[PDB]
Ligand binder design. Structure first.
Ligand SMILES: [Cl-]
Ligand SMILES: [Cl-]
Ligand SMILES: [Cl-]
Length: 193
């Protein structure tokens, strides 16, 4: 049931985008990303390496989600959790459909921030998640304070629904319907985003 690895060219940014499954060999790198100042407030995983290892192992053995590393021209610089809403905490907050999916993400290295690279990456992984035939909706619940990500999500087709009082944050529940997404993905690829 896991999201498959993939590699695509993006002609807009003129880069190779590649996504692979996370493994335990990634623990030091991922641990470093979790200690970045732009990540800490939203992920809260600035914890000792020993603990991060135990957490990563548990998530890698979790069947409702797929952990991936996203890379630009082979350089790993983003972390992704792709999941089924039905088996996730967010299912409790809205009348989800059976095959709805969700996405969590971060850009790790500072050297990959501020360059608009989240768009081609997010559009690519969304496209591959939407190839599940019965999935019509993908949801996201960014912290309500993460104005930049709320903006990025809106630009990719996500519509805000309502705040969600989650254990770790007040999120903004947002839904992206496939027909809207394909139009935005096509706008992107046709240089009219
Ligand atoms: Cl391609
Ligand atoms: Cl392309
Ligand atoms: Cl967030």
């Amino acid at each position: 049931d896991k999201l498959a690895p993939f590699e695509v060219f993006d002609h807009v940014v003129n880069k190779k985008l590649s996504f692979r499954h996370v493994t335990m060999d990634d623990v030091d790198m991922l641990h470093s990303w979790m200690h970045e100042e732009h990540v800490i407030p939203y992920w809260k995983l600035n914890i000792p390496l020993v603990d991060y290892k135990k957490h990563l192992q548990t998530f890698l053995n979790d069947d409702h989600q797929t952990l991936m590393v996203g890379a630009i021209n082979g350089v790993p610089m983003s972390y992704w959790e792709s999941y089924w809403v039905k088996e996730d905490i967010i299912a409790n907050y809205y009348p989800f459909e059976e095959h709805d999916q969700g996405i969590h993400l971060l850009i790790g290295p500072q050297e990959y921030l501020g360059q608009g690279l989240i768009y081609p990456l997010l559009l690519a992984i969304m496209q591959q998640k939407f190839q599940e035939p019965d999935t019509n909706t993908i949801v996201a619940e960014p912290d309500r304070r993460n104005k930049k990500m709320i903006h990025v999500f809106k630009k990719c087709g996500f519509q805000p629904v309502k705040e969600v009082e989650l254990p770790d944050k007040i999120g903004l529940l947002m839904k992206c319907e496939q027909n809207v997404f394909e139009k935005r993905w096509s706008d992107w690829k046709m240089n009219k985003f």
